[PDB]
Each structure stands twice: as structure tokens, then as C-alpha cells.
Amino acid sequence: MDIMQGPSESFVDFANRLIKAVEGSDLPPSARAPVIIDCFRQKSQPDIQQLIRTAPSTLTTPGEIIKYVLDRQKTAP
């Protein structure tokens, strides 16, 4: 309900509220991921949601999104 990413909130910040929020629910293990998956695309900021929204590759899991988030956040010069 009140799970919304902040203006300048880090990724690990939101996902913790999400994951913890999801774990706290009656959602099954196999369905926990799919929940966070859609949750991001609808609760994440425009900066992240935009990437996930039209992001290629089979991004159907958390293990891929975070990898994808950091993979895109690879601002290492």
C-alpha cells in the first residue's frame, strides 16, 4: 500500500521494504518473486521503472533485475 520508492532513495532501500513486506505476507515461495517483479515495474521510480519496463532479456526474476539494475548502474569509469 505505502510501498513507494523515495525521490533519492537507493535501490537496496526499496527492495528491503518490498522483500520484507512480501515475506511478511502469506505469499508462497514460488510466488514471492513474481510479486516483487511486478511490484517494481509499478512501484519503482521512473528512472528504474523505465529500464525494467522496456528492459530486454528474460527478466522474470529478482536475481536478474538486481543484476540488471547494477548491470545498468555500471558507471565504473
UniProtKB/Swiss-Prot annotation:
Where is it located? Virion
Q: Which residues are marked as site: Involved in capsid protein dimerization upon acidification? A: D26, D38
- Tell me where on the tree of life, at the top rank, the source sits: Viruses
Quaternary form? Homodimer. Homomultimer. Homohexamer.
Query: What's this protein's function?
Result: Self-associates to form the irregular polyhedron core composed of hexamers and pentamers, that encapsulates the genomic RNA-nucleocapsid complex. Assembles as a tube in vitro. Binds to inositol hexakisphosphate (IP6), which allows the assembly of the polyhedral capsid.
Designated name of the protein: Capsid protein p27, alternate cleaved 1
Full-protein positions shown: 394 to 469 of 701
